[model samples]
Target: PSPAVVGRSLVNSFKQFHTRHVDATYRLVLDCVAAVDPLMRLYTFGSTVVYGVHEKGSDVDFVVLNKTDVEDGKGGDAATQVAKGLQADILAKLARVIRQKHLSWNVEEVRRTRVPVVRVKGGGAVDFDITAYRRNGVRNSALLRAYFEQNPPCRWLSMSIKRWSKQTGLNASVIGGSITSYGFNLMVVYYLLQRNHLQFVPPSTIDVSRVEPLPPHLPLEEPADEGLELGTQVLDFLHFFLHEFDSDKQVISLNRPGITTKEELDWTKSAEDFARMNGEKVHYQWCIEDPYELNLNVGRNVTPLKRDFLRRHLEKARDTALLTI
Candidate 1:
């Protein structure tokens, strides 16, 4: 729809405009990554790369990792210094690019020796925290993303669950619940893989456009029209949840050394479970706020979109009048 069209709802107008800016910024970031040549690998993580509850607003997250970074942290190794230098260079370039493109975003550059992190704003509002980090030194930003891509079990499960919950009038309550579900499911899958010594494609490697079959135990059906109905997807997700919870299919014991009990929040469970196990014990909470009124640190900054509002808004456009459904 052309900007000349008038009478767009507050949501639709913002949504369209935000997409234009974000797509543009994405290229700028990719180019910056190439230019910085961090010597360390930089790969994107979080929703921007992975398919998720994206609407009009979402921010990108990337994790850059290098071996020298960890070694240097321990003892001022040359590799570590080099890693730091690369990181500093990237940040300088990123800030400049962000300003150049006029992309309204909040960026956090953490200096800690642990994995470095960069968080961006989402929803045309620089609120929600989108972040990235190092994984196992090789900097599995790409590898980790690939893990999510190929792991239909994780990505599809989350997507289906979110859609279902939204359709079932549980959308409002299920956002955190769905994330908890995905996190927990990942733990289970990780355990399964390690125990069996298996190698499967990660979620990031799987093509979003492809429609693959769900794992046997899952309740997912093949995509009907490339996308499942949001409500049905939620129920299917719940079905899978009940199955796993009931089966007690525990593997890859958390009691083992270097094991962290992955978080799969049991919103239905006692509050104690939530405070301790949702996403490695990171708390997930909800709130009711007027987004237009003030910035809130939740969900990406993409403008929130309502389908009906979008349709109505577009009807006013001369060209958009022809678009139906």
Candidate 2:
């Protein structure tokens, strides 16, 4: 970025502020996947792929599906044994590479090393959860397309609800972090869909805020003192959150949001409860080593999952970083 064009546009701002760690995870994943299985395919499905809130603190979410599953056993149980084997081999080699060279970034196993999840060293250490799926699952893809096609509008509403909390002094930091970490990218995808650009969604279309409802309670304000009780508040928020957002009719209605109208979604108790619980500092990880049994057809392998696709994003990121042409 030229010093002369510092604060110009959203692209400039994104180039200036948007973190590349998320995209970098995609590259590292491609490299790892290639080493494991040249025919393996990977993609971003959650918030990061869309332009929603959780972009700031989000970790990398990937769907690594075996392309050879069409042969029924060509990959030989891709979701379980095969996937797991590949993960172990790739991660071990990557670790060796980083350690042998004394690289600048940190590389290590996560979740006690039971799963093949890796954590990269950086300002926001990118955590990747690789979900593996067998090749021929239509049930997975169909549901995903139907879900996203019907529920595109809620993307805006969900973010608005979160924004409302921030503006109203609610302690939405915990869920808020999760929101920005992944939600922002998801909304981007939704925005594209609303514009009739349907290439983005795959596997299962997910709404991170869509949860089972609990009883409603009074909205609380951010406490005066920072230290506050946690469990109770989180429960309160969860309860209220459920009632406001979890109703079946709302989520399925397309036009009607279960927690429709930001006013109906209470945040009064969230902040104090969030503060007391110290929930803001908490991090959530959904890293799975081998979700082999997990069917991820999304009704479409139509979307490109090539390494070059990933490389495109990587080059775009590098270009963004070196903005001043």
Candidate 3:
């Protein structure tokens, strides 16, 4: 009884802290991007799109789609090359538009990245990152939304964990080399996947219908106190990675029902081996397969030492959760 109350209270309080406002900031950027390239229709992907997995000062992720982004869809590598060139041109054009309009937002064109992105930060300290042709992010967010739809606890557990990860500074792959926001969200999704026996629909097959609605007013009474599910989930989430997830031997995949392994995929190849083969760096100590791109590992950026750090914090969280659970 007490544990459920504690969970609802803690989650609600945490939700109160990361108050979201879909303010003029987003529409302003949307309008700006529309003005830049008529062909590139910007679609959002990430924390803002997902009902769960949001925190304060979170950046908005936009994917630019042009008819040509998928031109010659069956052309394989050649199509990808063409898309990359198109993306580069679109980003360059967008950058010029921002400068020419003298928009107050700070703009930076990040050329060297796996996913080329143009960064825009408003005076409000909020940011918007726009990328082209890379639907992996948008698909991942859609998958999370699907999971949230399938399971309510998925959101509750994730919301609590995301806040904790943010406060402990363990949630950034680029800035901290720890884990990406998407990485954290997937961890929760994967955790729940293992917890349930129900079949999961893969991201590719998921159809997300547009539902527009609008949070910030915190009330005294919340609805999560019915059971200890959320409380137990938070603790289980901490314990799952700390003890259950064998970082060396296993991988997390949302599509597969059974366990995916490092041994089978041979992603066991070391970072050096990766570069030797194809000028890429890889670490298999932890693997989180991308739902959209089967070849991609979302957790590859998680360094060995950072993995250890993540374990340590998870252990700390589990130990702390002991009080409530």
Candidate 4:
């Protein structure tokens, strides 16, 4: 931002990272799933399909909808139980189907996860994280897409920030303690909202139809060489977090404007009564609230030590930008 080359360099690096054409892998996944069950529907969601920030070599989140047996129009409690039972069975069947029909693709069913998912590796295009259902994934993707449509700078900053996090080894939310790419994207969006660069869609005030207006998503393409002044916004994002954000006493949320204290949602400490009853304590010290799924913390898995490690990288990253800040 302060320097001219910072913005130019990021855009160039982004252009170099994107020349990949991996559309066939996604189509093949749909075909494989279709052979097992013609009635099944495969839905693509997440940053790649929704926010336009995936690097193509990373895991693409896909959902295979096979819940026709959930009993249509049954909003009763019993229907939930049936849906829960179908999860493991469907995941197993899908794993078997992929291995049976496609011998080249390696498939592994993760039964121990909170939700059943199958890791599908094709003939070397990219990895696919396919799951039968995740509670708020598709919904979260749609909500972020809505905010992104309203704000153009978020995607540029998000793509650059996400790439930086990966290059720094701080983008391992699934296995490691650091936050995920979606968390970094959320951080970028949060920074824009604070600076009035992006519109703040805090907690369900817009029309439902407006959020899910259409499903037309095209492939990622190159932009102007200047990158719409991404250098300034990208540096501002780091500066905002490095010194401005009160990481200890505040919670990063998208629900409301102005300040959000850790005490706003009892995030200062884990509830003792619930922990005593369940015999397990839930960590609340590090909170990154999901806008749509208010109860879901994007950084719930991060520990104090891991967060410190991440913050150190942030400080150094800010310093690098400072040389050019």
Candidate 5:
């Protein structure tokens, strides 16, 4: 199938599914957030932004970029603003405004995670995860949108992989479970990078001293036709995870050419701090370093048991793919 055809079909399905609900509810939600911070920049991500492969029960993953306070015209730093956004007081205030505006909505108390979010169960059919922007996720979502627009396989493959992971219980992360949907998305992109299906120049390929900043949007690069049809792609995807993906050994990265290791990136040191802050074991067994924030491990939550569970899921998926193939 042509990638463009697949892209259009999936998009049509998305519009059909989302138009009614998104039109009314999305605006209301944004307005509530605006009441809290009118200057806040907004972004929609997750399945909501990625092909819109979501159900009525799906949560809207909304991001609010933090306002950089200029103190005496000397404190408008990007990192500081991001840190300020993650403050517990900021999220609490945002949650407070939403609660006051919509009494019927079930807005939970502000959660103080690495990425603070106000969890709201609005009167609509969907829930919402209103997160303070961490800089990378917003940009990454846009990059992914471009990738999907360029390569139709990525869109279909991502939709299919998310569906498969959710069904197999590999997408749960809240209960300290296995890989998250976002983690799975990273895995797919990493696999594409490894296979050279994604054509961005890797950061590691450039000299550290000569590395340049990435553009606001990555240009789309189409994948090659390597006899990779639907079933074959699925089977190969499962097989690739089952056989080649060693979470403990290699770092999953898309920004750099070739493989990037955790040790090389000093991610091991950060993992120690992450473990201490989260009060969990060093879960750097699998490192999915955020392309934009090189130090941030998106897979920092995967525990040893979760890693084992993920492997089992991969094996089962591979077996099923084998049977289907």
Candidate 6:
């Protein structure tokens, strides 16, 4: 098929499967969360915003941007009170509000996470992960959204890898010592980057093209695209992961041009003291450097054992894809 035909079909499919539903969900959820505080606005990222590859079972990841400094039964200035509320008890407050409104959502406060979030199970329907606004997440989402939008094949390829990661249990950065769904997405971005299907635009760039619309929330513009076929690229992605991935050396990046490595970043130079099951140790491994937060290692949670499993799992996937192709 020609690129124009494929792009149009995929764009229409995106509107049908992703955009419309997100609009509906956003409106519904906005009202629900707004009751807690009119200042709280819901923004989504993750698979829903990036690849438009989510279902009823998938989580509606919400970044509840709490912008107000109203009193929470505390005698402090609004800014101080709101800041404290977000830092300490925003989830608890929201949970109380959810119950008060009689919303059919089961709220579980997940404190033992890389970043704390409230997991809300909305009856038997889709789940919701509500977190305070983090600039890094919001920025990363825009960057990837632009990257995905620039190339049509990137959407299909990312969705495929994310599905594969879930089935293989590699998409658990929240609770376990493994690669995250976002981490896997970055790997796909890096894969596409290597193949020239996507290019590294300055995260600071502001020029817009028809292919890449400027998302209002993010400062990043749409990245330039390189046309590629989804079918061939998907198979090639699996093959590359199996044969070419070297965690010890390569850094999975979407924010920069050229291949950046762990050695260049001095990942081993700094040590964060965290208590693991084994004991207290400095955490550093195959680095997935955050393009926005250069100092933060997004893939820092992945332990050596989990890293091995990641490699092994991808090896199996490569063989399966090879045989199937």
Reference-based TM-score of each model: 0.38, 0.37, 0.81, 0.80, 0.74, 0.75
- Model 3 error, position 194 (Å): 0.5
For candidate 1, lDDT tens digit of each residue in 1-325? Answer: 3222211221122233212243444444555555545454444344444342233333444444354443432222122456556556656566555445545665556553222445555345443221222332222223323444444434443443333334333332234222222233343344334434235543233322121111112132333333323223333333333343222212222222223221332322243244432133322132111111111112111112322232233232223311210
lDDT at 253, model 2: 14
Q: What is the TM-score of candidate 3?
A: 0.81
Per-candidate Cα lDDT values, in order, are 0.33, 0.35, 0.64, 0.64, 0.59, 0.60
Model 4 Cα displacement at 243 (Å)? 1.5
Q: lDDT tens string, model 4, 5-75?
A: 67766666764463134356567777777777888766666666556545645777777664441222112
Q: Model 3, which residues run further than 4 Å from truth?
A: 1-9, 18-23, 52-55, 68-85, 197-199, 207-223, 270-272, 276-280, 321-325
Tens-digit lDDT string for candidate 6 (1-325):
3343333333333332234355666666677677767866566767666664454346767666533321121122222335435644766777777666655667788755546587777665546777764444555666678787677556666765666676677777343436677877888888888888886767655211111211222222122333235445655776676677676778777657777877677766345453342233434666787766535576776777777787787677654541222
Which is superior by lDDT, 2 or 3? 3
Candidate 5: stretches off by over 4 Å: 1-20, 52-56, 66-86, 110-112, 173-176, 201-228, 267-275, 321-325
What is residue 200's positional error in candidate 4, in angstroms? 2.4
The digit string of per-residue lDDT tens for model 5 on 1-325 reads 3334433333434332232355455676678768887876555666656543345456767666544421111222244434755555666877888889888888886544555677788555758787664445555655555455546557556655776676666666344455667777777777876776776643323221111111122232223443245445555676677788776678887666678777787767555765553445556767886766636677776766777787787777655542222
Per-residue C-alpha lDDT of model 3 across residues 45-144, encoded as one tens digit per residue: 7776675434566777777665543342222222255666777888888778876665576789986555668887766655778777655555567667
Candidate 1: residue 96 Cα off by (Å): 8.2
- The stretch of ten residues in a row with the least summed lDDT in candidate 6 is 206-215
> Candidate 3 or 6, higher TM-score?
3
Model 5: lDDT of residue 61: 74
Which pairs of residues clash in candidate 5, taking residues 3 or more apart in a chain or in different chains? 202-256, 202-257, 203-255, 203-256
lDDT by residue (tens digit), candidate 2, 1-325: 3212221321223331233455556676677667666786665544443322234444555555544433242222444556666666655665565444435656665433223655555444654454444332222223233443444433332333333333322211333222221222223233333344444433323222221011111122222223122212222222332343232221111122122221232222242244211123211111111112222111111112321232343243223322222
The better candidate by TM-score, 3 or 5, is: 3
Task: Please give the lDDT score at residue 69 for candidate 6.
Answer: 21
At residue 305, what lDDT does model 1 achieve? Answer: 32
